[PDB]
């Protein structure tokens, strides 16, 4: 009994002797027992047990561990809880001497305590030891002998680990550990210690099911809960590569297969899981079968060992998921007051007769939803895999039956009547007679009458179709926002023509690249902007000089000539950018849902302040002219001022105004009349950051939507903060007509809380894009899940528990194996938080492709705030690693021309 | 004149757009002009210059730069300094407008000053303007025509930087940065923005002759004077791999050897320099010549974009020093006011017709005297370039001739005489005679004499003697503290042998391999600790039980029969521990150094409370038994009790008393009666961390020395804390007969304020290690710098300015090209600063092999504080980088058997 202690145990010594009391080693173990017991034989069965295995009467010399063959266990006494309390809560206390370092407690009501350092025992080892006592207690409550072999001494463990390399050990985890540089995030989980437990019960058919399959193919159904865990961790995760605990013996010899010994060894190891998109679950299973057997060979380093060893950063866990196969006077319970530590998330696989899974979760990371979700998950995993093992693993099924449905069929069930005969212009012309002396356009002084508009259109219309427009005609407009640019667009409508807008400030190069990829031939513009058109063959007609020309010819109404797949108007999205074909199903569709969700009546005045090119203008204009409203042109003086854009709105007894998201953000923090005109402010296009007050008299519609469908594919009602809102307001749910998904890489649904790419399917969609159809069928592909399109957004997206769906960002933005396990977002949501920060943006890399190193631009209030204090306030709310190198501090955001942050000109730090 | 922003451009537009008023990349220029002027023809000369250089009437669109060919420069006023207060302050403005971003004023007393940013222009591209406008006015102050060519249009390097691969020139940064992992450390500079110059002449004939020499063998000036700093920063950092600044055109084609022009290109780029032992000066001359070279060929890519691309952390410079060569109505001064940002050590080579050098630091960051210093090594690398170049680079010498003397000989001037004919046991019967009946032993009540103590000691010498004891033996003692022990040691001596410690705590193996390694045959002990003795063949006396058997000898005095070079005494330090043989010359020169710096005399009572393996016990026992003064043996229950300990040194009346190092650190703490008999309090053996208060009645002497040098070499008194201090008390100056030495790696001389390993040549050098005659030769070699032997301590230490030594830790534990720029013991000072910290210290890797990980182990002085608020404490007082990644907070030290921190023992964290 002269031995070394093993490097594990030294660590655990040293860190006890030389830290405060701690009890971070201290395990209790706490035994419901009812009946009545034999106190005397009782305690002689534990002394028993302490008499045999060796560790159980150790002590240590301090770098060295002495075995006696003396001491035992004391109770302390026996005979409104009370325990917890304070009895059970006191124990900063084991020393290091002969008296083995355990100390035991039996009770009034029955209840037994033990108390014991982990330099001896190893979670693996308590069984053991109950079993034991128990079984010497009832070969004893009747004077016979309970046999049992003779334990090996565990001092030969030590001389065993000796006997091993650890530079063999040392370079195996560090050559599979290699590219593994961040832990597999969850993303199921909460932003931010009480433990919870929820039994998954698998039926006798899937359990006997399983172990066939295990049978069949040299596998065991410690390895099919693995794979199980596996393929669910890819999917939550998106990463292709997972990483988790396992539970081994770490006792070796191949004693693992007949002997059962006491004392510490190394219990939980590191299995990192690769799933390629062409692996099968066979051949899969047995890969997995042998990385799990391997890593068993290399179980003579202890975990911390293997994490510094690994690329993880030090600090940080390599995993927060554990799997655990437990292969294994009536007791009642074993409750495991260790609660010292656990892991977030461990999944327990108790093989009684009927399989149970236990999920034991921290109930701060996980709701009982989600834990609930994910019980099916692995119920549906496993069903798929008995049912058809030749299946590829990314493939298989994981949601349940009542899933998929609701959120692919019942979420999605949005289809609603509207008039798909019908075109723009029509439903445009219905307005104009039956209200023609209704105001349409209004422009500071300037007003049209839906008479003057519909006139003054058919003539342009006239004008144009004599000048060869007619359906598919893409005709130029280039022109400041006013009545003018209201009748050419109804003009080109009319002709049976399809605008394509031209900025007023663009270059003339960029002009010049608009001409030649839209082909058109003709421009309607104003004498004020005529000659920065380039000249490039076109005609170009000034509604403002050339007026006379177009007032010769007839106001009448046209025969109707276009077909709703005909297209409607031409609009660049941001190498190049590309023209997004746009017809007129489209916008019937998107003018019937928007009339209807915002209530628009002819009483209503709607405003129209986005620039022309941007999709947004296409919104504003004829939800509200196919109305009967009247649409107010802004002044871009307005709307440079917050305050002033409020009083305009107000002053000028607007209902229902669309607001870019940069600027909506800025009137919210403004404050407001509690009694206007102003029933509706809708906003959109970037990701809005703030809830509104309640103070707010208007109502604030979020909507988001590529060019590719229409303007908008998702709207939502924000109110004010709640509680179990997301950090930053929804995106809402699908309007009419449309179908979202929210997809993996494999184009596979996933559940809520998991994010993914989003894919619409709608009568919005674009015809493609102009002169690009290759990438028309790239993004624009056959649907999976019906015989309808689906276009892919490039969006990455999460539905919320109530089908509202939460915008993360862009897919390009993320990068494998850098997930974070912190939502960007969620920090921007906590910087935003301290009073002093108005608005700050998270990127991912603003360097270049060497590094990434996370920075935070940040808009202040007031000059008081500094990049210190915010780091520090950052290290106090989340974590590091949580937490970015740079900060910068803004004066204001790079926006681009229709509002949206502008990131590649954010400044690089340093 | 459309053209695209460079990508420097760029990143510095955006930075101006979006980041609050700056003023970063304002550059200000002021020119002190005397004489008189024709204001009229001066401005036109200016308008000349911005007529011609295209970058001087350029604006921006915002990714868009035009050149125009109409504005120029406007004067803003004319006609009790006041100019610096505001007129110069109020400079937060210049827009991307037509109009030149370059304001000037001319004044009063006739001083011009130039604003201009720097997206136009670079620090090249100034004294080309000046030059220019300087001599358009002299031929046109005479109505001539100063001629000019037409200088390129800076619209032609934006089409050469398109023309250009940035994949090329990024995987050539990316290569050659590889292994470079943090900044070449300077370590002369100061612990924490104004700037200094110090201009270092060369003679004419060192010009002269560096030129010559350049001509001879295809180098530059330049290449002479980057390889002069090349080699002076490897001395300074200790790498043989540096990394500095240098200055290039950055504008190319071939155009560097014919023309000049105006603009931003990229001016400064990083020069990584190898230097190796075997490197000869020339053929090393020539490859920095092409390296410098070389790395003009990848001058496309910015330095932001450089550092990120290297294997340097964000957020670091990748270099701290900049080497340029400025290879080009009279004008009094250019005073440059971009002061805005500067390098912490810039070294500017101007060659006129003697080469000045001129040297401009931050002056937070270094002392006058040090960069004064740092000229005179130029000075002496440079003249040793030209006397021989074909020297080895690692051997070229860097100390002056008056540096080199007061390092290596005036401070170690420490010949004293001292008798060396005489033996310790000699001097002992001298003090036994002429003061027989005073109290040379105390322990609690038991009291020796010196007649007592010299008659028992004759009696166990003859007893030994019969026993087979002589000059050369080496008797084993292992025995409890007391009187028993001080007759042993004597009677050892006495017979002529050597005593070798056996420490009674120790385990019967650890003794077993002394008494293996020693080759003892006799033991003395007693008669508790004999049965603890393993039986190995030895013969033991019992110096309580056997009394009987040694009073039957004399009490007489023997001959003297020992010589200088006889042992005295072998002693373990701590594969295995490794015994130290050390003679009475030693011992002689310690005694007689020790009585004369403390002047000991026989009314001293001195303390004796090191255990006996430890070699301070020898330095408690003989200087105090010699000089005829009272040893107290110290019960170890008092010295378990700072306060306890205290009193007791108070009550006994001791005058001067040895406490090891961690506890003189608490003894410090305490408050202490003004009026005791304690006069000097010696500590040493680990690294002391804190200032004695004032009120400290005694004086705290501190003292350094390996047991292979007789105790001690070093010893210095230590005041209260200053302010010109080290963070850690000195370890003093060299003892007599000792004479110290700090190299390099190459046993190479360095200056103040560099560190290197201690090197001792001293009377009191061991013989060599016991049985290890190998190790023997590699630690004690000859003398590079005598006839006499030298001893590498392993110490890492540096000499501070007026001669004493900063003790920094061991040379094991640093490693290359992670040398971090703050020595650890610079963070455990400011650590220790904030209270609620008693005692921390700063490692480097407490984990293993794979990361380094720095962390901070911190004793606390009550639970208040923990290791967040901690964090945030050092990231306020240093930056990051200079903060460790754990801090474990410990109730106490690990502490080895001698009082030494035991790192080993440390906690890994996590
Ligand atoms: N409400 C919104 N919240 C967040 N992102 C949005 C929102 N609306 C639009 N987006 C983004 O803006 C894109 C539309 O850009 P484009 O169609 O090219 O003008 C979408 O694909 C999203 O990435
Ligand atoms: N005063 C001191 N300050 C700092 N380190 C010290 C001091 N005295 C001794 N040492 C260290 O202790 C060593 C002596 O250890 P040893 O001779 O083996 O007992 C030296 O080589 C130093 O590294
Ligand atoms: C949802 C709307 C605000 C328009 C959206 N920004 C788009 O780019 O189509
Ligand atoms: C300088 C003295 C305190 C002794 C020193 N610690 C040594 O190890 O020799």
């Given at each position: 009994?002269?031995?070394?202690?093993?490097?594990?145990?030294?660590?655990?010594?040293?860190?006890?002797?030389?830290?405060?009391?701690?009890?971070?080693?201290?395990?209790?173990?706490?035994?419901?027992?009812?009946?009545?017991?034999?106190?005397?034989?009782?305690?002689?069965?534990?002394?028993?047990?302490?008499?045999?295995?060796?560790?159980?009467?150790?002590?240590?010399?301090?770098?060295?561990?002495?075995?006696?063959?003396?001491?035992?266990?004391?109770?302390?006494?026996?005979?409104?809880?009370?325990?917890?309390?304070?009895?059970?809560?006191?124990?900063?206390?084991?020393?290091?001497?002969?008296?083995?370092?355990?100390?035991?407690?039996?009770?009034?009501?029955?209840?037994?305590?033990?108390?014991?350092?982990?330099?001896?025992?190893?979670?693996?080892?308590?069984?053991?030891?109950?079993?034991?006592?128990?079984?010497?207690?009832?070969?004893?409550?009747?004077?016979?002998?309970?046999?049992?072999?003779?334990?090996?001494?565990?001092?030969?463990?030590?001389?065993?680990?000796?006997?091993?390399?650890?530079?063999?050990?040392?370079?195996?985890?560090?050559?599979?550990?290699?590219?593994?540089?961040?832990?597999?995030?969850?993303?199921?989980?909460?932003?931010?210690?009480?433990?919870?437990?929820?039994?998954?019960?698998?039926?006798?058919?899937?359990?006997?099911?399983?172990?066939?399959?295990?049978?069949?193919?040299?596998?065991?159904?410690?390895?099919?809960?693995?794979?199980?865990?596996?393929?669910?961790?890819?999917?939550?995760?998106?990463?292709?590569?997972?990483?988790?605990?396992?539970?081994?013996?770490?006792?070796?010899?191949?004693?693992?297969?007949?002997?059962?010994?006491?004392?510490?060894?190394?219990?939980?190891?590191?299995?990192?899981?690769?799933?390629?998109?062409?692996?099968?679950?066979?051949?899969?299973?047995?890969?997995?079968?042998?990385?799990?057997?391997?890593?068993?060979?290399?179980?003579?380093?202890?975990?911390?060992?293997?994490?510094?060893?690994?690329?993880?950063?030090?600090?940080?866990?390599?995993?927060?998921?554990?799997?655990?196969?437990?292969?294994?006077?009536?007791?009642?319970?074993?409750?495991?007051?260790?609660?010292?530590?656990?892991?977030?998330?461990?999944?327990?696989?108790?093989?009684?007769?009927?399989?149970?899974?236990?999920?034991?979760?921290?109930?701060?990371?996980?709701?009982?939803?989600?834990?609930?979700?994910?019980?099916?998950?692995?119920?549906?995993?496993?069903?798929?895999?008995?049912?058809?093992?030749?299946?590829?693993?990314?493939?298989?099924?994981?949601?349940?039956?009542?899933?998929?449905?609701?959120?692919?069929?019942?979420?999605?069930?949005?289809?609603?009547?509207?008039?798909?005969?019908?075109?723009?212009?029509?439903?445009?012309?219905?307005?104009?007679?039956?209200?023609?002396?209704?105001?349409?356009?209004?422009?500071?002084?300037?007003?049209?009458?839906?008479?003057?508009?519909?006139?003054?259109?058919?003539?342009?219309?006239?004008?144009?179709?004599?000048?060869?427009?007619?359906?598919?005609?893409?005709?130029?407009?280039?022109?400041?926002?006013?009545?003018?640019?209201?009748?050419?667009?109804?003009?080109?409508?009319?002709?049976?023509?399809?605008?394509?807008?031209?900025?007023?400030?663009?270059?003339?190069?960029?002009?010049?690249?608009?001409?030649?990829?839209?082909?058109?031939?003709?421009?309607?513009?104003?004498?004020?902007?005529?000659?920065?058109?380039?000249?490039?063959?076109?005609?170009?007609?000034?509604?403002?000089?050339?007026?006379?020309?177009?007032?010769?010819?007839?106001?009448?109404?046209?025969?109707?000539?276009?077909?709703?797949?005909?297209?409607?108007?031409?609009?660049?999205?941001?190498?190049?950018?590309?023209?997004?074909?746009?017809?007129?199903?489209?916008?019937?569709?998107?003018?019937?849902?928007?009339?209807?969700?915002?209530?628009?009546?002819?009483?209503?005045?709607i405003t129209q302040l986005a620039?022309?090119?941007?999709?947004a203008?296409?919104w504003e204009?004829?939800?509200?002219?196919?109305?009967?409203?009247?649409?107010?042109?802004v002044?871009?003086?307005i709307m440079?001022?917050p305050?002033?854009l409020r009083?305009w709105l107000?002053?000028?007894?607007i209902?229902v105004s669309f607001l870019p998201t940069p600027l909506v953000e800025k009137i919210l923090?403004l404050?407001?009349?509690?009694?206007?005109?102003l029933?509706i402010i809708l906003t959109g296009g970037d990701?809005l950051?703030?809830?509104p007050?309640?103070?707010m008299?208007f109502?604030l519609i979020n909507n988001?939507?590529?060019?590719?469908?229409?303007?908008?594919?998702?709207?939502?009602?924000?109110?004010?903060?709640?509680?179990?809102?997301?950090?930053?307001?929804?995106?809402?749910?699908?309007?009419?007509?449309?179908?979202?998904?929210?997809?993996?890489?494999?184009?596979?649904?996933?559940?809520?809380?998991?994010?993914?790419?989003?894919?619409?399917?709608?009568?919005?969609?674009?015809?493609?894009?102009?002169?690009?159809?290759?990438?028309?069928?790239?993004?624009?592909?056959?649907?999976?899940?019906?015989?309808?399109?689906?276009?892919?957004?490039?969006?990455?997206?999460?539905?919320?528990?109530?089908?509202?769906?939460?915008?993360?960002?862009?897919?390009?933005?993320?990068?494998?194996?850098?997930?974070?396990?912190?939502?960007?977002?969620?920090?921007?949501?906590?910087?935003?938080?301290?009073?002093?920060?108005?608005?700050?943006?998270?990127?991912?890399?603003?360097?270049?492709?060497?590094?990434?190193?996370?920075?935070?631009?940040?808009?202040?209030?007031?000059?008081?705030?500094?990049?210190?204090?915010?780091?520090?306030?950052?290290?106090?709310?989340?974590?590091?690693?949580?937490?970015?190198?740079?900060?910068?501090?803004?004066?204001?955001?790079?926006?681009?021309?229709?509002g949206?942050?502008?990131?590649?000109?954010?400044?690089?730090?340093?």
């Amino acid at each position: 009994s002269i031995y070394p202690l093993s490097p594990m145990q030294e660590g655990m010594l040293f860190h006890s002797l030389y830290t405060p009391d701690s009890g971070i080693y201290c395990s209790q173990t706490l035994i419901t027992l009812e009946g009545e017991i034999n106190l005397t034989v009782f305690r002689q069965a534990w002394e028993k047990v302490v008499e045999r295995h060796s560790v159980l009467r150790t002590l240590f010399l301090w770098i060295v561990r002495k075995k006696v063959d003396l001491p035992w266990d004391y109770q302390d006494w026996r005979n409104l809880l009370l325990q917890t309390e304070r009895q059970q809560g006191f124990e900063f206390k084991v020393a290091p001497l002969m008296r083995c370092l355990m100390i035991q407690l039996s009770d009034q009501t029955y209840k037994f305590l033990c108390n014991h350092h982990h330099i001896i025992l190893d979670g693996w080892s308590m069984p053991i030891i109950y079993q034991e006592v128990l079984g010497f207690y009832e070969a004893g409550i009747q004077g016979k002998s309970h046999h049992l072999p003779s334990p090996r001494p565990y001092q030969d463990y030590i001389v065993w680990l000796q006997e091993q390399n650890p530079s063999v050990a040392e370079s195996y985890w560090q050559r599979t550990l290699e590219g593994f540089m961040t832990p597999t995030p969850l993303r199921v989980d909460r932003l931010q210690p009480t433990y919870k437990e929820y039994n998954c019960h698998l039926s006798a058919s899937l359990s006997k099911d399983l172990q066939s399959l295990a049978q069949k193919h040299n596998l065991t159904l410690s390895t099919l809960v693995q794979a199980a865990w596996a393929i669910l961790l890819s999917r939550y995760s998106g990463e292709s590569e997972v990483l988790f605990g396992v539970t081994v013996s770490g006792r070796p010899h191949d004693l693992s297969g007949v002997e059962r010994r006491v004392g510490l060894f190394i219990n939980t190891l590191p299995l990192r899981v690769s799933i390629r998109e062409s692996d099968l679950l066979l051949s899969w299973l047995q890969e997995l079968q042998q990385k799990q057997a391997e890593i068993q060979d290399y179980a003579y380093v202890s975990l911390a060992e293997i994490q510094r060893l690994s690329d993880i950063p030090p600090g940080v866990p390599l995993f927060e998921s554990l799997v655990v196969f437990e292969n294994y006077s009536l007791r009642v319970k074993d409750v495991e007051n260790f609660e010292e530590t656990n892991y977030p998330l461990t999944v327990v696989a108790i093989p009684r007769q009927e399989l149970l899974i236990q999920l034991i979760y921290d109930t701060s990371r996980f709701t009982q939803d989600t834990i609930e979700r994910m019980a099916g998950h692995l119920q549906t995993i496993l069903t798929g895999i008995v049912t058809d093992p030749r299946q590829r693993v990314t493939q298989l099924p994981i949601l349940t039956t009542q899933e998929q449905h609701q959120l692919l069929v019942e979420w999605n069930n949005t289809e609603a009547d509207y008039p798909l005969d019908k075109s723009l212009h029509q439903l445009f012309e219905e307005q104009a007679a039956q209200n023609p002396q209704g105001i349409a356009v209004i422009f500071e002084d300037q007003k049209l009458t839906y008479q003057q508009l519909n006139n003054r259109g058919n003539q342009l219309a006239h004008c144009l179709r004599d000048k060869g427009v007619g359906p598919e005609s893409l005709v130029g407009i280039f022109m400041e926002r006013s009545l003018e640019m209201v009748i050419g667009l109804l003009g080109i409508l009319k002709a049976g023509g399809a605008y394509v807008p031209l900025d007023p400030d663009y270059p003339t190069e960029r002009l010049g690249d608009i001409l030649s990829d839209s082909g058109v031939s003709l421009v309607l513009t104003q004498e004020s902007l005529g000659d920065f058109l380039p000249q490039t063959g076109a005609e170009s007609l000034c509604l403002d000089r050339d007026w006379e020309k177009i007032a010769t010819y007839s106001p009448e109404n046209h025969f109707n000539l276009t077909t709703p797949e005909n297209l409607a108007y031409v609009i660049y999205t941001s190498g190049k950018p590309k023209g997004v074909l746009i017809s007129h199903r489209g916008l019937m569709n998107l003018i019937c849902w928007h009339q209807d969700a915002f209530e628009i009546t002819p009483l209503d005045k709607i405003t129209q302040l986005a620039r022309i090119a941007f999709d947004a203008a296409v919104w504003e204009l004829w939800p509200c002219l196919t109305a009967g409203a009247s649409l107010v042109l802004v002044k871009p003086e307005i709307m440079q001022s917050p305050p002033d854009l409020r009083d305009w709105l107000i002053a000028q007894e607007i209902t229902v105004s669309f607001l870019p998201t940069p600027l909506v953000e800025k009137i919210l923090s403004l404050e407001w009349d509690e009694n206007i005109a102003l029933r509706i402010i809708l906003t959109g296009g970037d990701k809005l950051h703030h809830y509104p007050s309640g103070l707010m008299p208007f109502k604030l519609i979020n909507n988001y939507g590529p060019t590719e469908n229409s303007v908008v594919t998702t709207s939502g009602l924000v109110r004010d903060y709640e509680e179990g809102n997301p950090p930053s307001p929804s995106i809402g749910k699908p309007v009419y007509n449309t179908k979202i998904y929210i997809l993996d890489q494999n184009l596979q649904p996933l559940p809520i809380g998991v994010p993914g790419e989003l894919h619409i399917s709608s009568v919005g969609l674009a015809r493609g894009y102009l002169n690009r159809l290759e990438l028309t069928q790239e993004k624009f592909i056959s649907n999976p899940f019906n015989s309808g399109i689906l276009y892919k957004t490039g969006d990455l997206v999460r539905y919320l528990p109530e089908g509202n769906i939460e915008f993360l960002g862009r897919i390009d933005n993320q990068v494998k194996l850098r997930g974070l396990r912190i939502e960007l977002g969620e920090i921007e949501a906590v910087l935003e938080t301290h009073s002093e920060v108005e608005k700050a943006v998270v990127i991912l890399r603003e360097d270049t492709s060497d590094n990434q190193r996370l920075v935070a631009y940040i808009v202040r209030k007031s000059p008081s705030l500094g990049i210190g204090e915010l780091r520090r306030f950052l290290q106090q709310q989340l974590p590091a690693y949580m937490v970015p190198s740079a900060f910068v501090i803004l004066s204001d955001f790079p926006l681009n021309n229709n509002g949206k942050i502008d990131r590649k000109k954010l400044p690089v730090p340093d």
